[PDB]
Amino acid sequence: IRDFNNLTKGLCTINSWHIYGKDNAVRIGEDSDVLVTREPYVSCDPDECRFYALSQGTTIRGKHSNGTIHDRSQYRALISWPLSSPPTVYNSRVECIGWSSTSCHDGKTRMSICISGPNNNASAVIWYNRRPVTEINTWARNILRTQESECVCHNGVCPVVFTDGSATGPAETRIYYFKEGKILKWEPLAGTAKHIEECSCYGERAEITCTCRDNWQGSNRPVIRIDPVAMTHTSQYICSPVLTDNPRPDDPTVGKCNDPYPGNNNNGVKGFSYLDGVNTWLGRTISIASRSGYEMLKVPNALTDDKSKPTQGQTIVLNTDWSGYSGSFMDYWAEGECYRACFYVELIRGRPKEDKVWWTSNSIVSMCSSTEFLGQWDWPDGAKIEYFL
Amino acid sequence: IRDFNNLTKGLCTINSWHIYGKDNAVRIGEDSDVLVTREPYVSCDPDECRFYALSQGTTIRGKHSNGTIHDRSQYRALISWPLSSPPTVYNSRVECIGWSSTSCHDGKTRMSICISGPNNNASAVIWYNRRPVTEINTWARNILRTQESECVCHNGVCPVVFTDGSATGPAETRIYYFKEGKILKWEPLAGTAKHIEECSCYGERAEITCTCRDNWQGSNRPVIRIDPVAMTHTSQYICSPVLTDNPRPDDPTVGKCNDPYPGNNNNGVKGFSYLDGVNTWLGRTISIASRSGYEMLKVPNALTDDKSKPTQGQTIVLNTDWSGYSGSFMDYWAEGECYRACFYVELIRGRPKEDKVWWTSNSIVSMCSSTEFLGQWDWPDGAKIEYFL
Amino acid sequence: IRDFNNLTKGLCTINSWHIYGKDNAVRIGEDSDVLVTREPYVSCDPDECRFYALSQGTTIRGKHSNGTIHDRSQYRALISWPLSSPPTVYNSRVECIGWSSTSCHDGKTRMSICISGPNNNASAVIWYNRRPVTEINTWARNILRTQESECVCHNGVCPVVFTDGSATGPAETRIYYFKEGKILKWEPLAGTAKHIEECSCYGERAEITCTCRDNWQGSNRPVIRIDPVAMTHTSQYICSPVLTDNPRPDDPTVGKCNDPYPGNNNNGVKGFSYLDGVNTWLGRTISIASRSGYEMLKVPNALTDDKSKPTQGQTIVLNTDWSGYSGSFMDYWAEGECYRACFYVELIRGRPKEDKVWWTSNSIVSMCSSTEFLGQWDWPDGAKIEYFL
Amino acid sequence: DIVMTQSPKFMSTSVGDRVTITCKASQDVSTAVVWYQQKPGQSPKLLIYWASTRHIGVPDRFAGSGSGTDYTLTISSVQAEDLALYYCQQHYSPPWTFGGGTKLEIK
Numbered sequence A, B, C: 001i002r003d004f005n006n007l008t009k010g011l012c013t014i015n016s017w018h019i020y021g022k023d024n025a026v027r028i029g030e031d032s033d034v035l036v037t038r039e040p041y042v043s044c045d046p047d048e049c050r051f052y053a054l055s056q057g058t059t060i061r062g063k064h065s066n067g068t069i070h071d072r073s074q075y076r077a078l079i080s081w082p083l084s085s086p087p088t089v090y091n092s093r094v095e096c097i098g099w100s101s102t103s104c105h106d107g108k109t110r111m112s113i114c115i116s117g118p119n120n121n122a123s124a125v126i127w128y129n130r131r132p133v134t135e136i137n138t139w140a141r142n143i144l145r146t147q148e149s150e151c152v153c154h155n156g157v158c159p160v161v162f163t164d165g166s167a168t169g170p171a172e173t174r175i176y177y178f179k180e181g182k183i184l185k186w187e188p189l190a191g192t193a194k195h196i197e198e199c200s201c202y203g204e205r206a207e208i209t210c211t212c213r214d215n216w217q218g219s220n221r222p223v224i225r226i227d228p229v230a231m232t233h234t235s236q237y238i239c240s241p242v243l244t245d246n247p248r249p250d251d252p253t254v255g256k257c258n259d260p261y262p263g264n265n266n267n268g269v270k271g272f273s274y275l276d277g278v279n280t281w282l283g284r285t286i287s288i289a290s291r292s293g294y295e296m297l298k299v300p301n302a303l304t305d306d307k308s309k310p311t312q313g314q315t316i317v318l319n320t321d322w323s324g325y326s327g328s329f330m331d332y333w334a335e336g337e338c339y340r341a342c343f344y345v346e347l348i349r350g351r352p353k354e355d356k357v358w359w360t361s362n363s364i365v366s367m368c369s370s371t372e373f374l375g376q377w378d379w380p381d382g383a384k385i386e387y388f389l
Numbered sequence D: 001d002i003v004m005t006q007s008p009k010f011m012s013t014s015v016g017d018r019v020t021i022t023c024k025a026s027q028d029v030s031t032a033v034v035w036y037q038q039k040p041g042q043s044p045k046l047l048i049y050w051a052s053t054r055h056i057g058v059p060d061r062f063a064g065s066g067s068g069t070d071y072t073l074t075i076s077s078v079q080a081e082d083l084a085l086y087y088c089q090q091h092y093s094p095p096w097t098f099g100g101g102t103k104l105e106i107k
């Protein structure tokens, strides 16, 4: 718009899900100059919504796609392209160079942060209106990381959650408040959460909600709620027995609000949730051991009630199909009474599970929320690992 | 424009046809990253006209083009691209995800509706200004379908005809009136028509005409005329003995206005007509059994007089060449006294008739109307199924 | 902007370097329609920054890339494309035709000069607002050459340094002052420098600094400082013992301000420096014999003090990796107190050193300056000469 | 190649009565079955196409039917002159394959 954005609405009644975006990137990339990506996401400008994702600097088909299972390198770069077109060599815009990103638009223009570096000496640089403004060098010296999906801004201020430290144990997570590229302040993570990675965040009624990842001990997901106005936050867990991280222990009868739920240590998968009282919906893979299938569950009050079991659901990716990372996003500039909630599901094709090929790319699926009850379909990446041989 | 459109003119004198658009998509797609499409069409913005068509999510040449004879899947998507350029991976805009579409622009911005789903649990989502606004879940639960060409809007209101039900027998066809994405009302199909599929529609003098497809028993085409202002419609058949559907029984001496004309049950092909009194022109394939050839015939008063035989004609695609689907469109914002009438002809290349290859794509040919008598030429897709082997 | 640019600021405190741009052009060009280039650079419009470079008129992979080690021909052309995207056939803009360029934007629009011709009868044509305005035919008749990176303009006036003559001995170097395409005046090179090639220039506080190349006898680099306002210049050498040209004699204890430093005659490599008193930083390859590695060194007062040895450094390209040409650039329209200093490093892959292939292309790396101390990483072109066999 | 199979190959009906000649494709051919008639020592005459559409001017007493892989031609009020060989053809995808022809004896 030509004015900062204020999250003035609340979420709309989430009664079912309608497909919003489909990539088909790996299927088309078997015969088009498509980029190998991973860690995908979706963010909207006032003007348009786009698929964002971390490039690997090669095409699926090019011989340099070999060994793209490695997450970080100097060939990675946050890139961006039209809603539902593949991430083609000829239509991707490079947003900045790095192997961890987050990107959001504040009403006036957008902030993109790409983190780069060796693991022991990494730096974040905060791009604003496509020029580097601020940079933040490492603080704990072992892999500074961030969101992996869009951030949310209220009146110029965008909280961005960063973790620096070990994924196996206590790490230094700090919440930074930027406004227009400059750091307005930062505080350290406070609350009952025990470890923070890859926070999926959305914003309503002047407040920001982030479902993150507990990599050390959590199988239930930790939640940070940030007051963008007062520049404070808190962190608790999702009480619900409906465990949503992956791999996970099987779901209990009663769960744990102020602590990690035991069972699968040193692992996770980025994930999201829509926490709105009765209108709460959660999403987990269907498999407890692997990233196969992805499903949405209405679990009224899952944040707060520690025996909330699901009342309505929706199958998104079939359990005989692969999934991966998920994250929240909304089109904050779309017309209406409220926020249409939406999310995305990375579809990881490649190594390690499908190691007949040596690349790891992924596809993207997006859905937004309908007040209706629309019927459901499953949405497969779709490629046959056998035509690339 | 920055204002709704009102169909204030009438059609111009249609005396012959001048080529408006040529794709050559399959010929160029034998060595370019071209998309496999079908169900093509053409719609105009105030600003520009574009070729629209349902993508299959693969390039002609890529190994995932195999089995694109199947009409619906989760890899299909309404895409769009420049007038007469091929539907390339790098220049297609994805309008929405689904396997049945219709798209029109109301003077201010455009409406695109993509239908998706399993056959027994499908949903329509109505995109307006590139954001999902309304969605409509199925009503009869066996393949909800719609137009397959552009819709027409008068003062914000766009009637869109949908059928849900069996293509072999009575089905639930409803006319929906949208304005700006929201449903203003909908009524059920009323009149003497017996089944409705794929209505080709154009608009003049504040009224909307739709030549559709009778799939159950019709070999003559059923016609819906919709008052966009009063939000009502009626349906009768094309009286003329000049049968225009395909396959068809051979044309009679006298025909049938208020009923389907007997002979070829459970079949058709989407088709169009320009019904304007003396200035009526109809179009049918040249072959009665197959989709080969396409020709235009001036048949004065074909809607109403049931012995109207053609007085002037024009060969568009040669009978030794393939055709396919046709549909109407006009550039409602073009300058002048009247509406230049135009249409398109899908050129289906591939399976099942040319099964030496396993893909089904198509090319597009467009023509608009000249007051002149311009001489004629035939317009072949042009590719040799033998260079893809 | 819609107004000429005045260099009103000074450089910012240069304390470390943050990556600004990465191409990965050769890696992606092993399976995308990428152009073979060399002599790359980066210039900014008010609006955006772009990678510029001299095309060779072929793709890496096409059979006409063979013998692109030759510098000049009629297939070369100054081309331009998005920050950090590869120089693709489908996204390059041809700026003009020739084998030596320089390009800069004066606040209002941009000047591009491409030099062309046989070596004994060459001509420069100065394009302004994408139309040829002025042209300058040769003066010494043996290869008229120029900058190879962006020029700098103050209030309409852009000094551009040209050399015409022998690279082995005295040559006719003239400084031209253009304003809007027309020549405002030109003077001949004056000062203690002995030969001038490929001047890297940046601008601050109404003055223009150019670190050039001494091809005849210099291993220390000659520096031209041009008053854009008064239309005068002077030339001295970089006093510092920290020799920065390549190949070079090993660095001494005491150096030479007003003369070339002896040791390696008839050779160099285009290079740059940021001369700002204590805040001076220089850059040289790491190897004295070859273009491998590239590193930045803080050498306080290196212009003037002839025993200045480095106090802080930063490794940019590893000595086990290839480098090539470097040049300065800044985003003169970026917001703030000062000029963020930046540079680029051409990464030459191909013949002659890697002659297993017959092409010579290159990649590009860009970095800008941080006031912070950000940690360092090395940035390899990245391709494996073995996958092109 | 889609194989069309006819059995039996000889059939006998009385005058004024009915006969049903079965034809059978070896995969779903989507009603794209043509029936020709070859009157003893003459050309074939295209009788019906798309399983039931009569060509120009064959009398409505020739009725065809079918789905999938099973089609049939019925002749009612069998004239002494319907004695001929009846042939099904497939008209869906190349090459156009025929059935063996069934001979109709009049009883």
Ligand SMILES: *[C@@H]1O[C@H](CO)[C@@H](O[C@@H]2O[C@H](CO)[C@@H](O[C@@H]3O[C@H](CO)[C@@H](O)[C@H](O[C@H]4O[C@H](CO)[C@@H](O)[C@H](O)[C@@H]4O[C@H]4O[C@H](CO)[C@@H](O)[C@H](O)[C@@H]4O[C@H]4O[C@H](CO)[C@@H](O)[C@H](O)[C@@H]4O)[C@@H]3O)[C@H](O)[C@H]2NC(C)=O)[C@H](O)[C@H]1NC(C)=O
Residues within 6 Å of the ligand: A016, A241, A242, A243, A249, A250, A251, A286, A287, A288, A295, A297, A309, A310, A311, A312, A313, A314, A315, A373, A374, A375, A376, B120, B121
């Ligand atoms: C047209 O479309 C509509 C709309 O989509 C269709 O209706 C929808 O259809 C859905 C399927 O019928 C239905 O969802 C279901 O809703 C119930 C509530 O009534 C919900 O409990 C279901 O979720 C459980 O079951 C699914 C599989 O069906 C599991 O994948 C899911 O994880 C849930 O079970 C697991 O978690 C529960 C909570 O802890 C446990 O109680 C349960 O034991 C189970 O746990 C095991 O597995 C876990 C992982 O798989 C593991 O971690 C754990 O440890 C345990 O081992 C399901 O979502 C929608 O509500 C319904 N909506 C509407 C409006 O009707 C309609 O059918 C379609 N029509 C046609 C003709 O097709």
Ligand SMILES: *[C@@H]1O[C@H](CO)[C@@H](O[C@@H]2O[C@H](CO)[C@@H](O[C@@H]3O[C@H](CO)[C@@H](O)[C@H](O[C@H]4O[C@H](CO)[C@@H](O)[C@H](O)[C@@H]4O[C@H]4O[C@H](CO)[C@@H](O)[C@H](O)[C@@H]4O[C@H]4O[C@H](CO)[C@@H](O)[C@H](O)[C@@H]4O)[C@@H]3O)[C@H](O)[C@H]2NC(C)=O)[C@H](O)[C@H]1NC(C)=O
Residues within 6 Å of the ligand: B016, B241, B242, B243, B249, B250, B251, B286, B287, B288, B295, B297, B309, B310, B311, B312, B313, B314, B315, B373, B374, B375, B376, D056
């Ligand atoms: C330069 O260009 C100009 C402009 O194009 C040329 O002049 C034009 O040329 C056209 C061809 O000469 C001419 O069209 C014809 O117009 C007559 C009216 O005068 C019209 O009847 C013709 O249409 C019938 O014939 C064509 C084949 O020629 C058929 O394809 C068409 O379907 C029409 O016949 C079928 O339908 C009729 C209506 O029911 C039936 O009466 C008829 O029996 C037939 O039916 C059978 O076949 C059907 C399917 O094919 C089947 O369904 C049915 O069951 C039956 O079995 C034809 O359109 C233009 O009028 C003329 N225009 C002008 C301004 O001159 C000019 O020659 C060019 N000059 C040069 C030097 O080349």
Ligand SMILES: *[C@@H]1O[C@H](CO)[C@@H](O[C@@H]2O[C@H](CO)[C@@H](O[C@@H]3O[C@H](CO)[C@@H](O)[C@H](O[C@H]4O[C@H](CO)[C@@H](O)[C@H](O)[C@@H]4O[C@H]4O[C@H](CO)[C@@H](O)[C@H](O)[C@@H]4O[C@H]4O[C@H](CO)[C@@H](O)[C@H](O)[C@@H]4O)[C@@H]3O)[C@H](O)[C@H]2NC(C)=O)[C@H](O)[C@H]1NC(C)=O
Residues within 6 Å of the ligand: A120, A121, C016, C241, C242, C243, C249, C250, C251, C286, C287, C288, C295, C297, C309, C310, C311, C312, C313, C314, C315, C373, C374, C375, C376
């Ligand atoms: C996280 O990142 C930070 C930030 O990058 C890291 O700290 C930085 O790390 C740098 C490496 O430790 C350090 O740079 C060094 O700084 C010293 C000054 O204290 C400087 O002298 C060094 O430069 C010389 O040495 C390098 C190799 O280390 C040479 O490549 C360079 O050319 C310099 O030596 C050559 O030139 C000198 C000047 O004439 C001569 O005195 C010397 O003899 C030598 O000459 C020979 O070789 C030449 C070509 O190679 C040849 O031409 C000549 O003829 C001779 O034969 C070096 O730059 C940064 O200052 C430091 N910055 C900060 C803020 O700490 C930190 O370590 C990282 N942390 C982790 C955990 O990894």
Ligand SMILES: *[C@@H]1O[C@H](CO)[C@@H](O[C@@H]2O[C@H](CO)[C@@H](O)[C@H](O)[C@H]2NC(C)=O)[C@H](O)[C@H]1NC(C)=O
Residues within 6 Å of the ligand: A066, A067, A358
């Ligand atoms: C690139 O892919 C190739 C095959 O496409 C990989 O090949 C293997 O390389 C290892 C050595 O690192 C050998 O032990 C295997 O036997 C090789 N197999 C084949 C089929 O050659 C290769 O490792 C990949 N990585 C790199 C860095 O080249």
Ligand SMILES: *[C@@H]1O[C@H](CO)[C@@H](O[C@@H]2O[C@H](CO)[C@@H](O)[C@H](O)[C@H]2NC(C)=O)[C@H](O)[C@H]1NC(C)=O
Residues within 6 Å of the ligand: B066, B067, B358
């Ligand atoms: C994809 O195309 C191939 C050939 O390009 C198809 O191949 C046939 O597959 C069937 C089994 O479904 C075999 O009985 C045929 O003999 C195969 N022929 C050849 C030449 O291999 C294949 O069916 C197509 N579809 C899929 C889903 O792979």
Ligand SMILES: *[C@@H]1O[C@H](CO)[C@@H](O[C@@H]2O[C@H](CO)[C@@H](O)[C@H](O)[C@H]2NC(C)=O)[C@H](O)[C@H]1NC(C)=O
Residues within 6 Å of the ligand: C066, C067, C358
């Ligand atoms: C183009 O590349 C080819 C190989 O890709 C070069 O081939 C050599 O050409 C010279 C003659 O000029 C022969 O003596 C060598 O034996 C050739 N080698 C091969 C492998 O054929 C060729 O020189 C390059 N240049 C041109 C102008 O064709």
Ligand SMILES: *[C@@H]1O[C@H](CO)[C@@H](O)[C@H](O)[C@H]1NC(C)=O
Residues within 6 Å of the ligand: A003, A004, A005, A006, A155
């Ligand atoms: C945004 O929010 C702040 C605090 O709620 C308010 O004072 C400001 O005027 C609002 N501006 C806009 C553009 O909504």
Ligand SMILES: *[C@@H]1O[C@H](CO)[C@@H](O)[C@H](O)[C@H]1NC(C)=O
Residues within 6 Å of the ligand: B003, B004, B005, B006, B155
């Ligand atoms: C459009 O049509 C309506 C009804 O005919 C009329 O009242 C309105 O003013 C017209 N607006 C435009 C832009 O033509």
Ligand SMILES: *[C@@H]1O[C@H](CO)[C@@H](O)[C@H](O)[C@H]1NC(C)=O
Residues within 6 Å of the ligand: C003, C004, C005, C006, C155
């Ligand atoms: C630019 O500089 C000149 C001389 O310093 C000054 O007179 C002129 O007004 C300035 N214009 C702008 C746009 O800064």
Ligand SMILES: [Ca+2]
Residues within 6 Å of the ligand: A214, A215, A216, A217, A218, A219, A245, A246, A264, A265, A266, A267, A268
């Ligand atoms: Ca965990």
Ligand SMILES: [Ca+2]
Residues within 6 Å of the ligand: B214, B215, B216, B217, B218, B219, B245, B246, B264, B265, B266, B267, B268
């Ligand atoms: Ca029909």
Ligand SMILES: [Ca+2]
Residues within 6 Å of the ligand: C214, C215, C216, C217, C218, C219, C245, C246, C264, C265, C266, C267, C268
């Ligand atoms: Ca030298």
